[PDB]
Amino acid sequence: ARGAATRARQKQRASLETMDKAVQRFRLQNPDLDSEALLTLPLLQLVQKLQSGELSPEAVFFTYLGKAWEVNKGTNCVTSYLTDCETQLSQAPRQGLLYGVPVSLKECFSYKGHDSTLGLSLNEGMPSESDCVVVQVLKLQGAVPFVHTNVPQSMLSFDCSNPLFGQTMNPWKSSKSPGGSSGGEGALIGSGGSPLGLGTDIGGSIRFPSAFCGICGLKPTGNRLSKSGLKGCVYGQTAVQLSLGPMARDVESLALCLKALLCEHLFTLDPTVPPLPFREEVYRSSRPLRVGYYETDNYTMPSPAMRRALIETKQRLEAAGHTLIPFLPNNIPYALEVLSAGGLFSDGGRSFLQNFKGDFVDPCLGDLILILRLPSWFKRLLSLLLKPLFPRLAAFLNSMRPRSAEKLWKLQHEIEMYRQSVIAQWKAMNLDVLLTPMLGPALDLNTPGRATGAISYTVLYNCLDFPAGVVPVTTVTAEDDAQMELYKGYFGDIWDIILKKAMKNSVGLPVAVQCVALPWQEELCLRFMREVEQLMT
Amino acid sequence: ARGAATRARQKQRASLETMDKAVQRFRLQNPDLDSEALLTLPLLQLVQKLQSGELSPEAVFFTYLGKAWEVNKGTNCVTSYLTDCETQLSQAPRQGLLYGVPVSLKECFSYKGHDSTLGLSLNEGMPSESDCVVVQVLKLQGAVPFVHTNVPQSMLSFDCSNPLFGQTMNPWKSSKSPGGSSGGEGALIGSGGSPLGLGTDIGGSIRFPSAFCGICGLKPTGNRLSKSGLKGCVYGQTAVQLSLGPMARDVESLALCLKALLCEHLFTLDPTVPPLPFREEVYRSSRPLRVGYYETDNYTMPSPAMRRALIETKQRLEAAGHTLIPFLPNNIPYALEVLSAGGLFSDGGRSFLQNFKGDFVDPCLGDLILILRLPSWFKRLLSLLLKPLFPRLAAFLNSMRPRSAEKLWKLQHEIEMYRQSVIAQWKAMNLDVLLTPMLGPALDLNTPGRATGAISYTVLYNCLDFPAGVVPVTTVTAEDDAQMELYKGYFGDIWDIILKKAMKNSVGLPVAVQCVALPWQEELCLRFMREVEQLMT
Numbered sequence A, B: 001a002r003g004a005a006t007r008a009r010q011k012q013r014a015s016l017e018t019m020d021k022a023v024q025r026f027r028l029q030n031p032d033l034d035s036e037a038l039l040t041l042p043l044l045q046l047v048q049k050l051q052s053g054e055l056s057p058e059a060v061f062f063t064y065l066g067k068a069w070e071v072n073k074g075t076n077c078v079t080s081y082l083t084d085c086e087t088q089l090s091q092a093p094r095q096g097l098l099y100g101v102p103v104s105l106k107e108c109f110s111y112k113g114h115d116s117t118l119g120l121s122l123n124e125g126m127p128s129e130s131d132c133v134v135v136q137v138l139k140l141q142g143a144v145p146f147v148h149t150n151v152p153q154s155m156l157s158f159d160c161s162n163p164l165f166g167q168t169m170n171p172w173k174s175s176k177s178p179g180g181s182s183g184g185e186g187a188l189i190g191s192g193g194s195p196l197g198l199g200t201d202i203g204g205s206i207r208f209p210s211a212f213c214g215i216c217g218l219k220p221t222g223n224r225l226s227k228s229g230l231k232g233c234v235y236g237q238t239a240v241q242l243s244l245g246p247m248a249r250d251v252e253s254l255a256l257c258l259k260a261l262l263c264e265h266l267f268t269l270d271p272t273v274p275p276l277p278f279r280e281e282v283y284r285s286s287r288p289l290r291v292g293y294y295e296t297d298n299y300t301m302p303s304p305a306m307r308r309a310l311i312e313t314k315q316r317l318e319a320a321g322h323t324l325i326p327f328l329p330n331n332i333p334y335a336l337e338v339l340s341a342g343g344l345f346s347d348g349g350r351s352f353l354q355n356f357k358g359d360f361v362d363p364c365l366g367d368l369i370l371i372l373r374l375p376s377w378f379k380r381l382l383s384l385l386l387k388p389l390f391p392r393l394a395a396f397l398n399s400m401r402p403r404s405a406e407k408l409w410k411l412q413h414e415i416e417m418y419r420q421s422v423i424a425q426w427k428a429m430n431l432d433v434l435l436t437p438m439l440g441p442a443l444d445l446n447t448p449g450r451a452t453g454a455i456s457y458t459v460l461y462n463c464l465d466f467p468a469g470v471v472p473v474t475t476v477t478a479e480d481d482a483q484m485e486l487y488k489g490y491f492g493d494i495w496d497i498i499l500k501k502a503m504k505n506s507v508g509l510p511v512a513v514q515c516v517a518l519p520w521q522e523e524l525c526l527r528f529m530r531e532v533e534q535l536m537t
């Protein structure tokens, strides 16, 4: 039954042929148009050229669609091509704030008459009845969703690889992961086949690909945007918050996507989302900033690249008049091991493991499926046998123990209290915004699966439900790749060894830096990113 | 051990003698002043006469403290006097939107150096370390919190009584409940002891005391207002939403309080609340509305008083030019029995039962504590044995069966989906607001304990997390109590049987209607509440 991944492979092959036979039907008819200086336009310049009618909507759709096709030959990022575009081009509203703009979709944003497989033979049957809510609003805003992009198998991976469609590669280097789980998004927007795209984030899936491929990405407060058609593979887990949001080549575009999204159509097609507009005044501010920072979280050791990134943008922010304050949120081990990991695995992983009945398990996933299937008595035995030796691992196995509804209630209270305590710590130092190292040079291929402890930096602000953003600031020089031989993490356990060998051999590869604000302050967060981008690039 | 209820009985008698000596030492120092025209001033005029300086802060505090001392001798609504006022009179901010206004808090709103015993022996030792966030912003807006008010025992009741402070009565008729679980708030605001107070509502606890005592009251969306230091007995419960909200004599006082609450101070003390301002221009609006209505939910039968009030207030809104459309939420028996009841009791009662260890359980809580203490096997047996005869009571026992975390996520998702379906129902009939029966004349004394079914009208909107609002529209004619002998339920189980005896003997007592909008649409809800007040009264 799952041998019908051959059934998905031909669907993908067909969609790619349909792309190719529409761009040779365009590039023949339009032989004189400049391809390269269309694609290297910043989005703000691109939408302004469209609205001012200097370019047709057809010219900018088809130049991107060719460039999507061209880089998918390298990366394997494109899942399917969303056929009822061109008729979406014909009836696109002019006064919409994204009128010309083609958008790439993560596969999980459901689109009418198309499969939202998560990589799973379970969901290879049935196409969606209707377009999901944020897709509905992007279309009413003049945008033209054009592709689905690849994910890892259950979306619970920061690699990108999948039994139904294959592995996605990093456009900078073939031996490298594009990030995940919006890894298709990340591979396609890097190397220039898309100006704008949408991802999801529950442990860092907007920020992993952004940081690995050297693009910009924001994870808003979980209830800023509407989830009202998001295909997930477990539902109803409400401790550690899911968010969707934008991915792009510049932070200015993330601001555009968000302002286009935060409109009266959205607050009407989904009234559970609070009607909070894009506060342009808070974004466009040039008042100086009280900026929290840390060099490390005392959990995942930074790479020399991460550290060099962090300290350099610390210095440049100080030189531009911002006061830079030492700040570390309390009880990071407790936040990761019991709140985050125990919030994700509250049920033992039974709901998640039901997606995997009769399926192949992808090598990128590691041993996570094997370990979740182990009896609960054996989980607990392994847990306390490891506790005298490798306590991170001990806690990992302890988080996978199935809880009661009583014990979830205690966990959901511990989480709201912890969020309150970081809010009191933040206000005590009078911050507006906080700077964080983002997880360093893209890890090798099937190695995100074996380095679960490296999501520490990102998974914190899902647990807190703070807006977090990634902006690329530097690239790995031949001494940042040399000091990786003198790496040994804080714990010296198995996760640090995999991380040591995964992060090596990555000269010229982009490194990023994480920018966080408080809940519902995502335009303050974008403002800080604009500052960080401007100073470093 | 719980025998130190008598530690609180003296604390109550001490605070009731401090109020008496202070109102005398003022009234002897101020003999010529008018009480009966100070008190009967509607809030809007009272704040505007406090703002202009026609009236003193001290002339409104010690008059209202006076009335609250007098009415308490006939209701037992007051629990403690909030001593560190008068310094709250001397240093109230002069341009605060409620600068003169004395406010009454429900017991659970925690206040520095005073207790929030929720009628429990467990909480009697320790006073609260800090003023809770909404108390804080009231004090930042010039309000004077002056009394803590009585609650039923664990708050899971719509009577009001407990083994620490004793029984609280309805001011209209001494044999009747004030409602609850803000029963001390309704009994105080009815009969003129307070211009304003805050309550909480997870199942009707702002609305019951509103409707029974003949006042106004609104349950906002769960995350419109901050819960930051609210005292509960179960923490970590997120399916079925707790909200706090204003209770007062007119809907303009609710909107005054809501606009005073919704300020940049509240969104700063607690950044988890979406910074959504009070939109005046939606509240002030006078454009005709499309109004959904139902006469019954087919679950709790209306009192002939209830049915009368609904159809009467239907006809008037039709005669003002509003268009009144038949509308009933899909699958109400499903949302009460499995989603709400299940959602409240998904741990089997364990967390809720820990507050009764060594406590007296109060006779107004009925047999709830006796039934939750029953072991799993007997509950399941009694469930499948009552299901041919008495389906409601079986489903009730089926909801107290202890779920796993897997079975809680499923329920959370079913809840988030059920919301979506009632929203889609609302928008395909293109509604603005909804008009709903409200649980009729006040029930007797120890009687809400054995009429659990009758919360169906109110608890549906905690399940849906939609704004709900109570506004009085009539009082019970001798004809409404006449047709009350002809009442038979839709089931004739023990809940309907108790409901006949408890709602009889009620001529002259108030009856109210319920007003529902979409999530986050509070000002529109209040706008519809204004009109239904403006027509009927």
Ligand SMILES: *[P@](=O)(CCCC/C=C\C/C=C\C/C=C\C/C=C\CCCCC)OC
Pocket (backbone or CB within 6 Å): A155, A156, A157, A158, A180, A181, A200, A201, A202, A203, A204, A205, A206, A336, A337, A340, A341, A342, A344, A345, A392, A393, A395, A396, A452, A453, A455, A456, A459
């Ligand atoms: P994206 O938001 C996130 C991709 C998932 C991250 C990859 C692997 C982790 C999967 C399961 C582990 C669960 C919890 C561990 C989290 C924090 C604790 C850190 C380790 C301490 C034991 O996809 C939508």
Ligand SMILES: *[P@](=O)(CCCC/C=C\C/C=C\C/C=C\C/C=C\CCCCC)OC
Pocket (backbone or CB within 6 Å): B155, B156, B157, B158, B180, B181, B200, B201, B202, B203, B204, B205, B206, B336, B337, B340, B341, B342, B344, B345, B392, B393, B395, B396, B452, B453, B455, B456, B459
């Ligand atoms: P207030 O918001 C609400 C007071 C509590 C209501 C009084 C008694 C009900 C207590 C427990 C029953 C739990 C769930 C039943 C709910 C709906 C189903 C209706 C009956 C069908 C079986 O206090 C803060």
